[PDB]
From a paper:
We established a process to generate bispecific designed ankyrin repeat proteins (DARPins) that simultaneously target HLA-I/peptide complexes and CD3e. DARPins, which are based on an ankyrin repeat scaffold, create an elongated solenoid fold that creates a rigid, concave interface for target binding. In this study, we developed and characterized bispecific T cell engagers by combining two highly specific DARPin molecules to target the tumor-associated HLA-A∗0201/NY-ESO1157-165 complex and CD3ε. We demonstrated that DARPins can serve as a novel scaffold for TCEs that combine high specificity, potent T cell activation, and minimal off-target activity.
Residue numbers in the entry: 13 to 169
């Protein structure tokens, strides 16, 4: 199972092994049971070089796991600014919504990643996007105590 070994290499941050498995024929979009792909796992663990290798191998940058999250959601939630930037350059959907209505901007605002908030805004993120409870990214920032981010977002409204 090359797909499973690729999921493990991507999660573990094994750059050489990811390249060899891709050359051997591993499905770049292999999925585990919750539907996460090697791109999701590399974004999760902050492995920038693996993300770039996966993108060059035509990984689907907007693949959604069963929660509806894309790799951009993952990278934005976990603070990985360089990965957010490379995903955006590859065509990641800055306004993709998961099953609770969160965009990547919701997650960057909720988890207090101001630099990522600024990058997403430069990429056209919708500041007025509402989740399924009606809440905007600025609402989430305020709720989590990140007043500087809420001010930036309310300024951009």
């Amino acid at each position: 199972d090359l797909g499973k070994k690729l999921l493990q290499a991507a999660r573990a941050g094994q750059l050489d092994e990811v390249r060899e498995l891709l050359k051997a024929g591993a499905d770049v979009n292999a999925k585990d049971l919750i539907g996460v792909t090697p791109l999701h796992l590399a974004a999760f663990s902050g492995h920038l070089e693996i993300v770039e290798v996966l993108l060059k191998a035509s990984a689907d940058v907007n693949a959604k796991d069963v929660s509806g999250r894309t790799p951009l959601h993952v990278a934005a939630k976990h603070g990985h600014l360089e990965i957010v930037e490379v995903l955006l350059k590859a065509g990641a959907d800055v306004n993709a919504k998961d099953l609770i209505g969160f965009t990547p901007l919701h997650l960057a605002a909720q988890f207090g990643h101001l630099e990522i908030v600024e990058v997403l805004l430069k990429a056209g993120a919708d500041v007025n996007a509402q989740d399924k409870s009606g809440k905007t990214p600025a609402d989430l920032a305020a709720r989590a105590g990140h007043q500087d981010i809420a001010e930036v977002l309310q300024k951009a409204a």
